[PDB]
């Protein structure tokens, strides 16, 4: 049982990439570059 009881989720936008938030577009559209290659292979 998930008694949790909490957790934003109330905009019209919701980016697709990482799922983020955003109450206006433009918001989100200058967000969703950062899914841009921001970064190189910070794994392995
Ligand atoms: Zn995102």
């Known amino acids: 049982?998930?008694?949790?009881?909490?957790?934003?989720?109330?905009?019209?936008?919701?980016?697709?990439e990482?799922?983020?938030?955003?109450?206006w577009k433009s918001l989100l559209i200058v967000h969703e570059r950062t899914h841009?290659?921001?970064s190189g292979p910070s794994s392995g």
Do not use: L
Request: net charge neutral; with cysteine; charged share 15%.
């Open 1 to 16: 049982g998930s008694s949790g009881s909490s957790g934003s989720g109330e905009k019209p936008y919701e980016c697709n």
């Open 18 to 23: 990482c799922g983020k938030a955003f109450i």
């Open 36 to 38: 841009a290659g921001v």
